[PDB]
Amino acid sequence: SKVVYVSHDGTRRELDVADGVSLMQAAVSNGIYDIVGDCGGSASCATCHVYVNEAFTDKVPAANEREIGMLECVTAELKPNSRLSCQIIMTPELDGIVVDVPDRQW
Ligand SMILES: [Ga+3]
């Protein structure tokens, strides 16, 4: 699928996230996520907290409590679609997803 990542600083990236990848994984390989070593592509991170555009946040799978605190590690007023770069998976239909890292600290 077509996925696009936006850094909370205002940078954007667009990768190809097929079936079995996560918004992070693709970007990850692309270095988009040169963060720390928590999720390692398994949704165990406190820094990949990101906001998916409401359009791909409703199609994506339902994130579990593991995507709530991990993702809420940084007080970013967790939205309804917020999620750590490594928790949503991309299907061959949900393509065109736009991600964004929360600058909620501003
Ligand atoms: Ga992560």
From Swiss-Prot:
User: What UniProt keywords are attached to this protein's entry?
Assistant: 2Fe-2S, Electron transport, Iron, Iron-sulfur, Metal-binding, Transport
Cofactor requirements of the protein:
[2Fe-2S] cluster
The 2Fe-2S ferredoxin-type domain is annotated at 1-105
A Pfam family that this protein carries is: Fer2
Q: What terms describe the molecular function in GO for this protein?
A: 2 iron, 2 sulfur cluster binding; electron transfer activity; metal ion binding
The family database entries (InterPro entries) matched by this protein are listed as:
2Fe-2S_ferredoxin-like_sf, 2Fe-2S_ferredoxin-type, Adrenodoxin-like, Adrenodoxin_Fe-S_BS, Beta-grasp_dom_sf
An example GO biological process term is: P450-containing electron transport chain
GO annotation, cellular component aspect: cytosol
**Family matches, as SUPFAM superfamilies:** 2Fe-2S ferredoxin-like
| Binding site residues for [2Fe-2S] cluster | 39, 45, 48, 86
Q: What's the record's note on cofactor binding?
A: Binds 1 [2Fe-2S] cluster.
Looking at the keywords, is Metal-binding present?
yes
- Which protein family is named in the record? Belongs to the adrenodoxin/putidaredoxin family.
Q: What does this protein do?
A: The oxidation of camphor by cytochrome P450-CAM requires the participation of a flavoprotein, putidaredoxin reductase, and an iron-sulfur protein, putidaredoxin, to mediate the transfer of electrons from NADH to P450 for oxygen activation.
Subunit organization = Monomer.
What name has this protein been given in UniProt? Putidaredoxin
- Which species? Pseudomonas putida
